[PDB]
Every structure is written in C-alpha cells, then in structure tokens.
Amino acid sequence: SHLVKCAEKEKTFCVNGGECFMVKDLPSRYLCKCPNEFTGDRCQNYVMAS
Amino acid sequence: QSVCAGTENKLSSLSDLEQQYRALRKYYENCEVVMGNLEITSIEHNRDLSFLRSVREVTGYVLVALNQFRYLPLENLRIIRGTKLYEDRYALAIFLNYRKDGNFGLQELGLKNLTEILNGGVYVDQNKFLCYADTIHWQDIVRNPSNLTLVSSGCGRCHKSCTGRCWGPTENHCQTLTRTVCAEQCDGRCYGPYVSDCCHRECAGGCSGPKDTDCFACMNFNDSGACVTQCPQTFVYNPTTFQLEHNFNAKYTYGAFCVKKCPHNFVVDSSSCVRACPSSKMEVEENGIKMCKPCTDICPKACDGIGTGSLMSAQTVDSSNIDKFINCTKINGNLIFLVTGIHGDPYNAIEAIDPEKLNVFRTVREITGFLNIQSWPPNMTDFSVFSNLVTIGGRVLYSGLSLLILKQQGITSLQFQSLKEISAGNIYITDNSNLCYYHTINWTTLFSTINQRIVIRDNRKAENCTAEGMVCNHLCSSDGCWGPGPDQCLSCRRFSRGRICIESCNLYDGEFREFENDSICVECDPQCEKMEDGLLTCHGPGPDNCTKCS
Ligand SMILES: *[C@@H]1O[C@H](CO)[C@@H](O)[C@H](O)[C@H]1NC(C)=O
Numbered sequence: 001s002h003l004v005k006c007a008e009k010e011k012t013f014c015v016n017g018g019e020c021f022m023v024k025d026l027p028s029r030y031l032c033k034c035p036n037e038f039t040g041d042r043c044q045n046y047v048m049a050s
Numbered sequence: 051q052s053v054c055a056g057t058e059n060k061l062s063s064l065s066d067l068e069q070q071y072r073a074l075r076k077y078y079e080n081c082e083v084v085m086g087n088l089e090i091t092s093i094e095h096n097r098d099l100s101f102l103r104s105v106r107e108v109t110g111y112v113l114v115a116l117n118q119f120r121y122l123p124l125e126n127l128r129i130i131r132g133t134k135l136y137e138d139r140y141a142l143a144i145f146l147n148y149r150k151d152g153n154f155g156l157q158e159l160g161l162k163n164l165t166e167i168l169n170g171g172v173y174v175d176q177n178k179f180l181c182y183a184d185t186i187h188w189q190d191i192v193r194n195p196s197n198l199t200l201v202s203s204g205c206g207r208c209h210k211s212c213t214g215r216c217w218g219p220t221e222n223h224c225q226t227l228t229r230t231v232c233a234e235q236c237d238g239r240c241y242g243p244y245v246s247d248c249c250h251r252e253c254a255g256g257c258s259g260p261k262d263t264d265c266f267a268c269m270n271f272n273d274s275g276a277c278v279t280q281c282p283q284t285f286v287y288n289p290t291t292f293q294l295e296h297n298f299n300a301k302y303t304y305g306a307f308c309v310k311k312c313p314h315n316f317v318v319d320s321s322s323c324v325r326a327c328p329s330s331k332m333e334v335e336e337n338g339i340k341m342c343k344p345c346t347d348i349c350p351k352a353c354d355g356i357g358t359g360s361l362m363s364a365q366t367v368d369s370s371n372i373d374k375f376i377n378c379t380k381i382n383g384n385l386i387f388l389v390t391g392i393h394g395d396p397y398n399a400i401e402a403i404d405p406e407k408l409n410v411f412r413t414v415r416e417i418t419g420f421l422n423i424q425s426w427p428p429n430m431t432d433f434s435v436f437s438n439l440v441t442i443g444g445r446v447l448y449s450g451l452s453l454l455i456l457k458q459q460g461i462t463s464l465q466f467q468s469l470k471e472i473s474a475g476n477i478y479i480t481d482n483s484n485l486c487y488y489h490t491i492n493w494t495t496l497f498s499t500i501n502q503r504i505v506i507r508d509n510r511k512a513e514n515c516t517a518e519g520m521v522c523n524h525l526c527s528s529d530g531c532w533g534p535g536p537d538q539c540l541s542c543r544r545f546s547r548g549r550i551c552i553e554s555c556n557l558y559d560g561e562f563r564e565f566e567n568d569s570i571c572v573e574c575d576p577q578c579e580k581m582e583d584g585l586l587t588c589h590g591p592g593p594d595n596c597t598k599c600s
Pocket residue numbers: 125126128163266
C-alpha cells in the first residue's frame with residue numbers, strides 16, 4: 001500500500017469515526033477513510049440520498 | 051445542460067471500496083457539466099467507468115489518484131476551468147494510479163478532447179504503468195502561466211500519423227493541438243493552420259468555424275449561443291451626446307449566462323443577478339423585483355453566513371464564530387450546524403458550543419442561502435431559537451436543498467413559528483426519530499416554484515404521533531402547525547392576537563378591548579374609554595375611531 005496510519009497527534013484530524021492516513025511520497029499528503037454514514041475532507045458531513 | 055455538484059473530499063474516501071465506487075457513480079453519472087470538482091480516488095481494477103463519458107466540462111479541478119483501473123474514459127471532457135485548484139495549484143492531478151505490489155494500474159488516459167485548462171497546472175506523476183501521457187504537449191492545453199506543467203518505460207511508440215504526440219497506440223489517438231499550431235494571426239485557438247481557421251477570441255476548447263457561435267465552450271458568458279466577454283448592459287454610452295442611454299436589448303448576467311430575467315429569489319444590481327447586496331446598499335422590492343438601492347441612512351444588520359466573506363473559511367457555526375451573529379436580522383449566506391460545530395472540533399482546538407449561545411439567532415428574520423441542521427444540542431427539543439425566521443431564500447443550495455434537518459434524535463417539534471417562505475430549493479427532513487409535527491405541514495404553501503419538492507423520511511410515524519396526542523391545536527387551519535399550542539399554527543381557523551390564534555377578539559369584555567382588522571385582533575387606542583354593557587370600545591384604529599374619549 002501507498003498509505004500509512006497517522007500519528008496520535010493527527011488522530012482527531014478525521015472526525016465522526018474517520019481513520020487518518022498519510023502518503024509515503026516525497027510534502028506528505030493526508031487523507032480520511034470514512035464510515036458509510038459520513039463524507040467530506042475530514043468525514044465532517046453526513047452522507048445523504050433520495 | 052445536465053449539471054451536477056461534484057465532491058470536495060480530495061484524497062479522502064469511504065472505507066467500503068464498493069461504497070466508494072457506488073458513490074462515484076451516484077455523484078457523476080449522466081452529468082455533462084461538473085459544477086465543482088471531479089474526484090476519482092481509490093477505485094478497484096475490475097470497476098466500470100463508462101458513465102464518465104457523460105462529462106464534457108469541469109468547473110473546478112480533476113483529481114485522479116490511488117486507483118487501480120486500466121483506463122480513464124473521460125473521452126468527452128473538453129474543458130477544466132480550474133476555478134478551484136487541487137493543492138491551490140493543479141487543475142489536473144493524476145498520481146499513484148497503480149497498486150504498490152505491482153500487478154495492475156492506469157495504462158491509458160482517454161482525454162483526446164481535453165484541449166483547454168483555463169486556470170491552474172497539470173500534475174501527472176507516479177503512475178508506474180501509464181503510457182503515452184509523456185508525449186502530450188500540455189503547454190498547448192493550458193491557456194495561462196502555472197510554473198507546474200510536467201509528466202513523470204517499456205511503452206509503445208506513437209502512430210506515424212500522430213507526429214509523436216498521442217494518448218494511445220492507434221492513429222485515432224493523436225493529440226489534437228489547438229493553440230501552438232495556429233497561424234501567427236490567431237490570438238486564441240484554431241481548427242487548422244491558415245488565417246481562415248482561427249477561432250473567435252471568446253472560444254474555449256476550440257471551434258468548428260470562425261463565429262462566436264462556433265465555440266466548443268465559452269471563455270466567459272453564453273448569450274443565446276454567442277460567447278461574449280460581458281452581457282449587454284442596461285446603459286449604453288452615446289458618443290455624440292456624452293450621456294448614458296437605455297439599452298433595451300440589455301440582458302442580465304446570471305452565472306455564466308446572459309438571461310432575459312433574474313430568478314425571483316435573486317437580487318438585481320447593475321445588469322446582474324447577484325446573491326447579496328454590497329454592504330453600502332440595501333435590498334428593496336419594486337414590482338416583485340429585489341434590487342440594491344442606497345441605504346436611507348443606516349443599512350440593515352446583514353451578516354456573513356457560513357462560507358461567505360469574514361466566514362469564507364467556515365464549514366459550521368461553532369464557539370469561535372457564534373458571537374459574530376449578535377443582533378443579525380439577515381444572514382447573507384448559509385447557516386450550517388455540523389457535528390463538529392455543536393460537539394466541538396478538538397484537532398483545531400474548538401470547544402463544543404454553549405447551548406445558551408444559540409439564542410443569538412432569535413433576531414434572525416431571513417437566511418438568503420440555506421439552513422443545514424446536521425447537529426443540535428441533545429437537551430434542545432426544537433428550533434425555537436429560529437422563532438423569528440420568516441424567509442429562506444435558497445439563493446445558494448446544498449444538493450438542491452434549502453432546508454435540512456437530519457439525524458436529530460433530541461428534537462420532538464420544529465417550532466419555526468414565524469416561517470412563511472422557502473423561495474427556492476427542496477426540503478430534506480429525515481432520520482429525526484422523535485420529531486412529531488412535520489407531517490401536518492402543507493409545505494407547498496411555503497414554496498414559490500412548483501419544482502419544489504419535499505423529502506420526509508424516517509421521522510416519528512404520523513400514526514404514532516397522533517396516538518401519543520402530538521396533534522395540532524383546534525384553532526390551527528388544515529395547513530398544520532410547527533409544534534404544540536395555538537401560537538405554533540401555519541394559519542388560524544378563526545381569529546389571532548399577535549402570534550396566538552383565539553376564538554374571538556376582546557370586543558365586549560377583557561382588560562384591553564379590541565376591534566377586528568379581519569381575523570387580526572388589534573387593541574383600541576389608549577384614549578378610547580372601556581365601553582361596558584355590550585358596547586364596542588372602538589370601530590377602528592387611532593383616536594379618531596373611538597366610541598367615547600377617556
Ligand atoms: C469531442 O468534441 C466534439 C465537438 O466538441 C464532439 O463532436 C465529440 O462528440 C467529442 N468527440 C469525440 C471523438 O468523442
């Protein structure tokens with residue numbers, strides 16, 4: 001994988017149960033893996049349909 | 051003509067990879083113009099992306115990262131405007147589109163029509179199995195300097211006819227150069243190499259002929275098929291008189307268009323459809339038309355909403371900005387309450403909001419954009435803090451919605467007491483398990499357009515509400531109520547004293563006598579003497595309409 005888990009400092013970065021990840025590339029790019037109920041750059045928004 | 055919003059997630063995605071794919075399909079299928087960003091991230095090798103062939107234009111940026119599929123089918127994409135850029139620098143970013151193991155990854159880009167990138171640069175790097183992309187003359191596609199326009203073995207050569215610049219192996223894969231190949235007299239793009247073949251200066255992408263009606267895309271505005279720099283203004287200077295004259299062929303600027311009329315919910319300033327009046331001017335209605343006119347003396351208290359001016363950066367109301375709303379009567383923009391607003395955002399050192407502080411909103415009469423309630427203090431059962439809110443303009447929409455109340459367990463009634471108008475957008479009231487009065491409201495009475503829908507799902511069953519006695523007061527009309535009591539009606543069955551519906555006015559008995567202004571009970575002038583023995587104290591307003599003087 002191109003991704004690694006974030007430090008404990010960056011735990012609170014992703015909200016609403018989002019899992020933080022960094023990218024190994026040479027700055028380092030951060031991302032959130034969201035639970036199905038949430039979205040946004042930091043899982044800050046609720047997913048919605050219909 | 052089939053527009054969509056697109057995401058703002060960047061590299062963030064859903065943990066469920068099928069849910070991530072299903073979301074991509076949900077957001078972008080049958081969309082021609084992405085009015086924002088086209089983000090394609092973390093998509094598996096097997097996946098079908100044929101639906102992306104629908105995309106012709108992207109307003110913001112194109113992010114294609116961390117995917118494993120062989121080919122990118124954006125075969126109809128012509129323009130990336132780059133109004134918003136990835137990392138505030140790239141209009142197109144294609145990177146890490148392979149699995150580190152080394153099995154599969156992106157091999158070919160189907161961007162044979164991508165001939166314009168209006169603003170921003172190109173970042174195509176770290177794509178282990180991508181071929182031909184190295185041959186692309188990006189300098190031709192990017193319209194303006196962007197000190198970042200670069201592409202970073204065992205790849206097939208371009209076809210002979212391609213002139214060493216192609217997207218794939220065949221003779222039908224050649225890169226169409228539309229700028230560098232032009233006659234020295236073309237200032238824009240071209241469809242050939244002679245002076246006959248130049249595009250109009252207003253064409254974006256390319257053209258099929260010399261006229262401003264022959265463009266593939268417009269550089270600025272579209273005025274009835276003609277690509278224009280600006281719309282016909284209301285005033286026109288006459289050079290011989292040295293005076294401005296009325297232009298009767300004037301049109302209004304709305305988005306990227308010259309329109310015969312502004313939407314009803316929008317304000318007219320100059321010959322343009324705007325969302326807000328300048329701080330110096332005030333909104334006024336003249337024959338149903340909202341306009342910006344200079345302030346009498348002092349301008350009304352209009353406040354920046356979430357994502358506007360002083361609060362451009364903001365995503366939600368929080369403890370750091372709740373105080374920027376003291377004494378606001380109008381909100382120029384939106385009001386959004388996210389989970390991280392109500393319950394605090396620890397990472398950015400923002401404490402959870404003080405529920406008492408939500409009372410700042412009791413002064414708010416109008417919200418020009420939208421109202422988005424995704425979070426609310428648990429001890430609070432209703433939105434009575436919005437007891438004075440009359441209008442939601444819907445001049446800005448969140449996925450076509452102007453009102454959102456979702457996932458709120460603590461709410462049992464709404465209590466939007468003063469609410470009378472939702473000018474644009476749809477309503478989305480879902481998953482508020484204990485909400486009870488919503489099902490009685492004839493939301494239709496609040497709408498302006500007939501295109502306005504209502505999405506009410508998974509709140510407390512209407513049958514369950516009724517059986518638990520959560521019904522409207524008898525003095526409410528068939529239009530419904532916001533919650534319990536006579537003060538909470540949408541309209542009265544009989545009379546009304548202020549905000550409360552009553553059976554009759556104080557005509558013959560009561561501390562303060564009243565006359566009936568047709569269903570509205572108005573108190574008699576203090577100078578009118580309290581007439582006893584079945585006599586009326588007054589027969590209208592003011593001291594002139596008294597029965598006897600005190
Ligand atoms: C590319 O653009 C042209 C004109 O804008 C249109 O004819 C076409 O459907 C797209 N071309 C291909 C080969 O998909």
